[PDB]
Each structure stands twice: as C-alpha cells, then as structure tokens.
Amino acid sequence: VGNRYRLGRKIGSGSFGDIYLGTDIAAGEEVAIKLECVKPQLHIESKIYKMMQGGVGIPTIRWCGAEGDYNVMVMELLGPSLEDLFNFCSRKFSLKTVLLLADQMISRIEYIHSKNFIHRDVKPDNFLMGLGKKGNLVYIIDFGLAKKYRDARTHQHIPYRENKNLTGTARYASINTHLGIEQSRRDDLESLGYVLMYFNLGSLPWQGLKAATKRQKYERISEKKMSTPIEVLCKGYPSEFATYLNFCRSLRFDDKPDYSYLRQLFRNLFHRQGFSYDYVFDWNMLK
Numbered sequence: 001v002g003n004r005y006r007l008g009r010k011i012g013s014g015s016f017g018d019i020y021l022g023t024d025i026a027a028g029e030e031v032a033i034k035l036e037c038v039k040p041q042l043h044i045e046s047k048i049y050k051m052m053q054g055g056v057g058i059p060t061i062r063w064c065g066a067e068g069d070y071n072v073m074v075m076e077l078l079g080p081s082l083e084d085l086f087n088f089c090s091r092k093f094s095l096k097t098v099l100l101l102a103d104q105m106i107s108r109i110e111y112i113h114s115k116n117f118i119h120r121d122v123k124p125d126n127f128l129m130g131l132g133k134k135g136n137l138v139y140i141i142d143f144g145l146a147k148k149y150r151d152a153r154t155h156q157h158i159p160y161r162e163n164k165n166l167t168g169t170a171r172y173a174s175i176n177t178h179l180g181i182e183q184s185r186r187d188d189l190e191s192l193g194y195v196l197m198y199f200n201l202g203s204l205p206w207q208g209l210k211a212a213t214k215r216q217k218y219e220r221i222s223e224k225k226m227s228t229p230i231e232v233l234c235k236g237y238p239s240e241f242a243t244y245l246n247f248c249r250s251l252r253f254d255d256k257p258d259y260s261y262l263r264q265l266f267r268n269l270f271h272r273q274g275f276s277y278d279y280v281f282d283w284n285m286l287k
C-alpha cells in the first residue's frame with residue numbers, strides 16, 4: 001500500500017478496523033497498519049489522530065488513503081500494551097512499578113482533553129509501551145469512540161444529556177457513565193483510578209460478573225461499583241490510591257479535573273519508600 005508500504009501480518013484490532021505489522025520498505029522501519037473496507041469511520045478517525053499529532057505518548061500517522069477495496073491508515077510500531085506486560089509479570093506489579101505507570105497515564109489523558117475530545121475508552125489495552133530507547137515511555141491509542149466535548153472555538157461544553165448508552169469498557173467505566181449521563185473529562189480519570197488498583201490487586205472486585213445480556217452485565221457491574229466503598233477497594237495499600245478515586249467521583253459534569261494534584265499524590269508515596277524514577281519496571285529485571 002502507498003507505493004512504499006509492505007503490508008504485514010495482523011497483530012491486533014482497534015475499536016474498528018484491523019491492525020497489521022508492516023514495514024516502511026523505504027525507511028527500513030517496522031510500522032503498524034489499520035485497514036477499513038471501502039463500502040465509514042477510518043477517514044473520520046484519522047482526522048482525530050491528525051488533531052492529536054505531536055503529544056507525548058501519541059502515535060504518529062504515517063499515511064492515509066485507499067488501496068483497492070480498503071481505506072488505509074499507517075502508524076509507527078509500538079511495543080506491548082500494559083495488559084500484556086502485566087500478564088508477563090504474573091499480574092503482579094511492585095509498588096514501584098504501579099507508581100511509575102500512574103504518573104504517565106494521568107498525563108496522556110490530560111493531553112487528549114486538551115484537544116476538545118474525550119477518549120471514552122481508558123483501559124490497559126489502549127496504553128502501549130514504546131520499543132527500544134522509547135521503552136520507558138507509555139503510549140495511548142485509539143480514537144474510534146472519541147467525541148468532541150467542547151466546541152473547538154467556543155469551548156461551549158456539550159449539553160448535559162441523559163439516556164446515552166455505554167461506549168467503552170464496562171470494567172473501567174465511570175459510575176456516571178453507568179447512569180447513562182453524557183461522558184465528559186471526569187470519566188476518563190475515574191477509569192484510570194480503577195486501572196491502577198487493578199495493577200495493585202491483580203484484578204478488580206467487579207471483575208468476572210455474569211449476565212445473559214451484555215446490557216444486563218453492564219448494570220450488574222454498575223451495581224457492584226456503586227456498592228464497593230473506596231476504603232475497602234484499596235485496603236492493604238498506601239492510602240494514596242483511595243484518595244485518588246474519591247477525588248474523581250466528586251467532579252462535576254463540565255468540571256476540569258486537577259491533573260497535577262493527582263500525580264503529586266503518588267510521587268510523595270514514591271519517596272517515603274525510597275524509590276527512584278529510573279524506569280526499571282518489574283519487567284526489566286526479568287532474566
């Protein structure tokens with residue numbers, strides 16, 4: 001595709017479209033390629049990546065076009081997702097590694113919101129570690145479920161609206177999202193908070209619930225989230241994690257979250273333990 005890309009073998013899937021590990025035959029570098037059958041979302045989603053280009057932890061779009069019966073989008077090659085690394089460590093991260101990750105993730109989320117969009121799908125799978133030198137960097141991906149929360153010019157927030165359906169992953173979804181309220185910034189962060197406790201515990205307490213309907217399991221998850229007080233969810237761990245989640249749940253619909261305060265929370269715990277930010281994650285010490 002594109003006269004300079006050698007399509008490759010599939011390495012995965014996004015919210016829509018499929019992903020392949022190709023090679024930019026001209027620059028001699030591996031890349032990942034997303035394809036969409038001509039006949040529509042790719043072209044729309046590519047325009048969102050284009051608006052995100054530049055940020056720390058935001059993959060770069062190399063090409064976008066059509067080849068035969070497919071519309072194509074090409075990007076730089078990234079490493080394992082956080083879900084994959086977590087699995088490679090026996091689903092056990094040291095306190096030092098959880099804190100290292102928390103810091104960067106709060107940051108990618110802040111960046112997206114800065115661009116008039118809300119992700120609406122924060123999970124370990126949409127966070128990929130870079131390769132090689134870029135191995136100490138956490139990346140964020142997929143803007144297929146993204147929506148503009150404010151007018152690029154007026155910053156006029158979208159109308160508070162109800163009876164909206166869930167667009168994302170139930171396990172990490174916010175309580176308000178469960179109640180059918182329009183999604184906003186606060187919801188992307190609450191999601192991260194659950195992701196961090198998942199890293200400390202191995203799983204979350206509303207994981208593995210069951211229902212006949214996808215719709216009925218989403219509500220059982222809602223019921224259990226609403227029934228698990230934060231001091232219980234975080235027992236046996238540094239108080240900082242409980243403090244973080246309580247902060248997210250108190251945010252108003254069109255409020256702008258205090259990102260910095262959150263990061264500072266974890267940094268202080270980091271020091272009392274005597275840790276250093278050398279990016280030696282648990283996975284790096286493996287032999």
Ligand SMILES: Nc1nccc(-c2c(-c3ccc(F)cc3)ncn2C2CCCCC2)n1
Pocket residue numbers: 011012013014019032033034059061073074075076077078079081125128141142
């Ligand atoms: N390794 C790697 N490097 C860069 C991007 C992606 C990628 C894309 C993706 C998005 C836009 C695009 F142009 C090209 C690829 N969608 C999902 N993934 C992954 C999710 C985790 C499991 C493996 C696939 N994967």
